[PDB]
Symmetry: D2
Subunit: 317 residues, 4 copies
């Protein structure tokens, strides 16, 4: 009932030359098939839980306390020995190691944000090619994952598993207005500009380990789906947009039970209206308030659309 946990945050862990992720399912929305993992880096945050931690608070008894500094060492050492190719697999690997090492712990939770790097083009004597030595630190969208593992009477189980992509920022330079809303006493065209966080859950949680890559859903593919649907669809709202992104993701990945969204509307204000469309148009940043949406799409929703004569859902062949 009581809240009780402790751990170490901002655990920067950068593994070089981890095993590559390869053999992904090819989809129309994306060219992403592999992730070379030359840098396999992340910002991890670990929390330990257990009833036996109580007196560390109530009595200042450090006897059963794994030092937070030691947890950091623990994570960093397991990054060196990990042989898999995915973030989710690594986190579950570390969680299970903690539990095997410390019998007095009841559960371990790991959250991680990718420390992202981009491949770049460099000029060489053989022309302009992709570098295998130099990479750009990306401050754009990044992969996320959360795994919590708890002890059971017969072993361990994953009690939470999350996968995602954060901070997708996209603008569409086409006309967008957004009408038909309630007009009352509280009531007071432009390139729709959105921030998107996307997460998903697996039917079979072992698929996230990447042991069979055809069943692993790479965040990069999801991002490409989102971008493609955004590009193609004539949306009626951000709500409407993310429903179709969700349907498409579920369509490409039947092994997922659910896809969820957290959005921001960051559309500019018009300052000088264009003379023909957006040709000659000038925009600026709006006042700080931003619209946001939260929504989950499920396989049952996809089945519903596919069986409805009135559905507008369309995906690439």
């Amino acid at each position: 009932e009581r809240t009780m946990f402790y751990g170490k945050g901002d655990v920067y862990v950068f593994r070089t030359y981890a095993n590559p992720l390869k053999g992904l399912k090819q989809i129309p929305e994306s060219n992403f098939t592999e992730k070379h993992n030359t840098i396999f880096g992340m910002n991890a945050k670990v929390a330990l839980k257990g009833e036996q931690l109580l007196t560390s608070f109530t009595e200042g008894d450090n006897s059963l306390v794994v030092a937070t500094d030691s947890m950091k060492n623990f994570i960093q050492r397991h990054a060196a020995s990990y042989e898999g190719a995915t973030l989710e697999g690594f986190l579950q690997y570390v969680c299970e190691a903690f539990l095997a090492k410390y019998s007095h712990l009841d559960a371990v939770r790991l959250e991680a944000k990718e420390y992202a790097f981009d491949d770049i083009q460099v000029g060489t004597d053989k022309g302009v090619v992709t570098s295998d030595l130099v990479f750009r630190k990306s401050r754009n969208e990044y992969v996320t994952a959360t795994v919590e593992v708890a002890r059971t009477a017969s072993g361990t189980e994953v009690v939470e598993q999350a996968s995602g992509i954060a901070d997708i920022q996209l603008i569409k330079v086409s006309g967008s207005s957004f009408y038909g809303y309630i007009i009352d006493e509280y009531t007071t065209d432009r390139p729709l500009y959105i921030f998107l966080n996307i997460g998903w859950a697996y039917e079979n949680q072992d698929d996230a380990k990447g042991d069979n890559p055809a069943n692993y859903v790479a965040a990069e593919q999801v991002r490409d789906i989102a971008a493609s649907v955004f590009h193609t669809l004539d949306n009626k709202s951000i709500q409407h947009l993310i429903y179709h992104i969700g349907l498409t993701i579920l369509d490409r990945f039947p092994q997922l039970t659910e896809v969820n969204f957290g959005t921001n509307n960051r559309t500019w204000d018009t300052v000088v209206e264009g003379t023909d469309g957006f040709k000659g148009a000038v925009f600026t940043e709006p006042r700080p308030p931003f619209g946001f949406q939260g929504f989950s799409v499920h396989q049952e929703d996809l089945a519903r659309e596919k069986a409805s004569a009135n559905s507008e859902y369309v995906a690439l062949k």
Copy 2:
């Protein structure tokens, strides 16, 4: 049967001037804070609308039952002008209930707010150095927080979630602190006294949620008082860990405010690394910032914990007397 579904407006800055003052707070030994003049009553609010009838706005792109997010902003700002109370929680509940009264198709309204904090300042006048009633400093230090969610009931509405807190307390204690007795194994850093430096977020929950409205200020728990308790306990107690510290901070808060059911904590250890050891304690010592990793704790203390301590012959819990 429970899809995630909500939408709203964030970063809704609302700055109300000359709101009704909060006065008549319970006087406690840990604090001199008894009143908050509310000359500026400002916040960053975030509103979310929920309801089953919102489904087709996603699935069909039907905006017929959609309250525009810009309209939500207006709604909040206008209610900031009409609000006659003195607390953040009271304002949020007022707005939540107003939304529900206006839009019958909505099932629940959630308001989260971060105080846009200001400090009184001392200025020179012909009458000497006094507190200004015109000029205030924008504080980038600790700030008050609150969340209120109100949902429909069979006979009307109710608060289904209520949180109150103080965020971003950053305190250092320049006395020798060590922390010993932890597990030592193969994962223990090789190397074997520093000024404990902590970040603190503190929250609390009311037994009767109406106490947060401040209609009777004697039952209102001011975040400023809570902050002063934390600071005082940190000062007086010789702690064995951050875990141990926040337990005693929690007990003290519950002791001063029996109308609270729970006090919760989120902490960071941001203690410096030693570079030059002092030649007499911390005299002549030099420290620097550590590598990024930080220890953290999360914990809740409840009235049952306090009653147990007071009934225990071996308790080390001590509070200043009234």
Copy 3:
């Protein structure tokens, strides 16, 4: 002598505990600040080394005459332990001169520092509520700044730049600020106002006539940033300003008036008028919100000659406590 050339170490966090206290400051009408206990004497320092003999470290990758940057960090941190003074400027000049004495191939050393600021707090005790001598709050508000650059000379060393300042003062005045009379043409949309809730960010700096006054050996001649801050706040409180330009001119005059040992006070300002959402009273009961991102800014310096002119003019509007 036209090339840009320097290297060094940034984000050198240096936290000295129990430094010698700053006490015996000049007492003034705008402030009660007379001493700074320096229980924590902390800063974020930035050091740059300059010199012609550093050229080949760039052009030839020759590290022979290179003080490695980690060594600069150690050097600074060790000197924080030995420094016996009470001011930021004194510490920086102390470090600069030490570097030049240690490394003869150096021509000049530059130190910039931003204070790592802490607040005294009130705690409850059995003897009542008092100021704690053990627990301090990390302040994310205004902080002290200083820059010292020292170059080698034929006879020793000289200070070639000395700066002192206070950064990130953020103050709001709810009423008592007007903006009217400006140019009205095809580009003006802004309504003229006799009253707006002025919200300002202020960076204030100053220069000493005698640069050694900054070492704090005679605290009565030392200008503490805390005093300058209190002056700015007081002038903001008292003056009915016509613009931020008008305001900072008077702040500067007032500062120079209290501290005749200063040659100039300079300003870097930012302005953020809230937007009115519900008009209030009048102005009590009003609701405001944050405006769009654009902000007005001002840069300006006031010198003793300006103050002398104001004091002798029959048309002067300058008034001090």
Copy 4:
């Protein structure tokens, strides 16, 4: 001998859509960049006005000759719609000159700008995976910078300051620094650097892009930096930025000088590889960072090209 005096407006976000494209850039071995479509031509601008006649606005609170800062914002945004050029430097000089022509009491106008950068992205279509012409990613990576200040002459106006640059390049190089001074203060990996690069034109009008073959695009400079970092075995960051500068001057003889501001953000080793970087683990260091500032000039390049002990090598044309 002269007081500091200026005022203006900062955070002037200006987003022009479908500006005239930048095309016809000089082809170089280090880069594939030949064009910038300018579908979005966006920036964060900062304008400062100067003039003797501004004195009484400070000293007397006299607003008679004061162009309100809000009006400056409008002035800039309105000039964004009519600007017919293709470069950031050209737009800024255009606005500077417009201000001076409009307000005779002004002596000089200074504009600084940070690009509000967007990336082309790949989307799935019925025609396959292609670059979208509608949807763009907001980049939080490196961005173009420029500063133009224009002052009056007896016969018109002149550019008194002109700067062009690229800010916040963040590159890591995966491959394996010695010889520095060893004394009592000396205690002392994949080199990780932050780079700001700027340059100056021999003929400042080249920055207008009226003759694109003479315009130096920040994208090309960035690709040069990346290419040199990739190929060169550096002995220090000082040594590295010297060669980046030489190569830039080599590709762009119309530049008089290139300047650098660098940060060393190299990780700390936690688990050593067995060996090379295979199995290696790194983490973030304590905050202190090495930095360098440096300018390279054409005279340096001419010296290197004629020197027998020169180590300078560039890719062939």
